[PDB]
Design an enzyme around this catalytic site. Structure first.
Site, mmCIF file in Angstrom:
data_model
loop_
_atom_site.group_PDB
_atom_site.id
_atom_site.type_symbol
_atom_site.label_atom_id
_atom_site.label_comp_id
_atom_site.label_asym_id
_atom_site.label_seq_id
_atom_site.Cartn_x
_atom_site.Cartn_y
_atom_site.Cartn_z
ATOM 1 N N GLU A 35 0.312 6.442 8.221
ATOM 2 C CA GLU A 35 -0.817 5.803 7.518
ATOM 3 C C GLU A 35 -2.051 5.728 8.434
ATOM 4 O O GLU A 35 -3.130 6.076 7.967
ATOM 5 C CB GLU A 35 -0.418 4.408 7.040
ATOM 6 N N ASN A 46 -10.571 6.027 -1.193
ATOM 7 C CA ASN A 46 -9.815 6.685 -2.281
ATOM 8 C C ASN A 46 -10.816 7.244 -3.292
ATOM 9 O O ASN A 46 -11.934 6.719 -3.375
ATOM 10 C CB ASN A 46 -8.810 5.692 -2.871
ATOM 11 N N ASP A 48 -10.918 6.788 -6.360
ATOM 12 C CA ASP A 48 -11.170 5.758 -7.390
ATOM 13 C C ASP A 48 -12.190 4.738 -6.872
ATOM 14 O O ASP A 48 -12.575 3.907 -7.682
ATOM 15 C CB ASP A 48 -9.871 5.114 -7.879
ATOM 16 N N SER A 50 -11.658 2.625 -4.398
ATOM 17 C CA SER A 50 -10.906 1.640 -3.592
ATOM 18 C C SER A 50 -10.890 2.178 -2.156
ATOM 19 O O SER A 50 -11.213 3.369 -1.933
ATOM 20 C CB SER A 50 -9.503 1.376 -4.116
ATOM 21 N N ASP A 52 -8.439 1.882 1.639
ATOM 22 C CA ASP A 52 -7.211 1.523 2.389
ATOM 23 C C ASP A 52 -7.635 1.040 3.782
ATOM 24 O O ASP A 52 -8.479 1.727 4.428
ATOM 25 C CB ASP A 52 -6.268 2.710 2.524
ATOM 26 N N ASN A 59 -4.467 -1.257 0.272
ATOM 27 C CA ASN A 59 -5.480 -0.796 -0.700
ATOM 28 C C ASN A 59 -6.168 -2.017 -1.325
ATOM 29 O O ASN A 59 -5.471 -3.007 -1.689
ATOM 30 C CB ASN A 59 -4.794 0.127 -1.712
ATOM 31 N N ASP A 101 7.121 -6.033 -4.201
ATOM 32 C CA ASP A 101 6.448 -5.919 -5.521
ATOM 33 C C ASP A 101 7.329 -5.156 -6.503
ATOM 34 O O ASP A 101 6.969 -5.165 -7.699
ATOM 35 C CB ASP A 101 5.067 -5.268 -5.412
#
Ligand code: NA
EC number: 3.2.1.17
Length: 129
Positions: A35, A46, A48, A50, A52, A59, A101
């Site tokens: 990562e 990202n 979209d 967003s 990280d 995110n 999650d």
């Protein structure tokens, strides 16, 4: 901060990530390697819009507030900047919520693609832990 491999393994253990939700410490070190390359200041935008953040590339879509991700949540109740700190406490606390999650460490696509099923104990081999 750019951690060493064994230095990060020890910081993750100190913060109780070792075998958290049944994921051995090598899994966490492997995910951090792919990562962020162990860099707490790592960021990635990202498609979209967003972003990280930090050693585990958490995110803004769900987990932290950066003020620039429309319609997003802040489920770890932190500013995304807290994830860039030399102290990994916020990243670890937030990663515990993510891995809880429902999809375990599949939430980290790089973990699924590059760590899952591999010899992850190699990531802690030789570390004084
Ligand atoms: Na957010």
């Amino acid at each position: 901060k750019v951690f060493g491999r064994c230095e990060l393994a020890a910081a993750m253990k100190r913060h109780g990530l070792d075998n958290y939700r049944g994921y051995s410490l090598g899994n966490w070190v492997c995910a951090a390697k792919f990562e962020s390359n162990f860099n707490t200041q790592a960021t990635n935008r990202n498609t979209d819009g967003s972003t990280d953040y930090g050693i585990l590339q958490i995110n803004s879509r769900w987990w932290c507030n950066d003020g620039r991700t429309p319609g997003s949540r802040n489920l770890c109740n932190i500013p995304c900047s807290a994830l860039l700190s030399s102290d990994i406490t916020a990243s670890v606390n937030c990663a515990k919520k993510i891995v809880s999650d429902g999809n375990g460490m599949n939430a980290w696509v790089a973990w699924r693609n590059r760590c899952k099923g591999t010899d992850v104990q190699a990531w802690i081999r030789g570390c004084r832990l």
